[PDB]
Amino acid sequence: KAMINLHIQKDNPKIVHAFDMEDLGDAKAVYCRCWRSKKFPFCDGAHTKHNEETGDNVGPLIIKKK
Amino acid sequence: FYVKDHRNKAMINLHIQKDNPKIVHAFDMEDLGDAKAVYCRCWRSKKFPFCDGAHTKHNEETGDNVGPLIIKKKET
Ligand code: FES
Numbered sequence: 292k293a294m295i296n297l298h299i300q301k302d303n304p305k306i307v308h309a310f311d312m313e314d315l316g317d318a319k320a321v322y323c324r325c326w327r328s329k330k331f332p333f334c335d336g337a338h339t340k341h342n343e344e345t346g347d348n349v350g351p352l353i354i355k356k357k
Numbered sequence: 358f359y360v361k362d363h364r365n366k367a368m369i370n371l372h373i374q375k376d377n378p379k380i381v382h383a384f385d386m387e388d389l390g391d392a393k394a395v396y397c398r399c400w401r402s403k404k405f406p407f408c409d410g411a412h413t414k415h416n417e418e419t420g421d422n423v424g425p426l427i428i429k430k431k432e433t
């Protein structure tokens with residue numbers, strides 16, 4: 292079975308991010324679930340290239356106010 | 358049965374909602390649905406988009422190092 296993350300922070304044995312929305316000034320955050328973003332843990336659109344290259348259908352998690 | 362899978366070996370999501378061409382979730386920043394959430398980034402959770410600890414077995418089986426995203430919601 293293949294790894295999901297190829298290159299990101301490989302000296303960390305399990306990559307977890309924790310954020311408190313109280314701390315944010317913005318109304319929206321877009322988080323990467325594909326492990327291909329160059330701005331991980333944030334989405335930079337790299338998922339579209341991944342989906343085309345591999346036939347996948349992954350995309351980000353968005354946290355936002357109405 | 359098949360003992361070969363000719364899909365691209367680099368595919369991340371193997372089984373989840375394959376009728377959806379791009380799986381995106383959007384949740385409230387405010388505590389309208391929960392106080393805190395732990396979101397799956399490995400596409401192996403049976404509770405996707407929430408983490409159920411499946412990442413542990415995935416990391417063990419593949420040598421990977423992926424884990425979840427923890428979001429504490431803004432209390433109103
Ligand atoms: S860059 Fe990874 S989900 Fe968008």
Ligand code: FES
Nearest residue numbers: 397398399408411
């Ligand atoms: S079950 Fe997928 S990151 Fe925990």
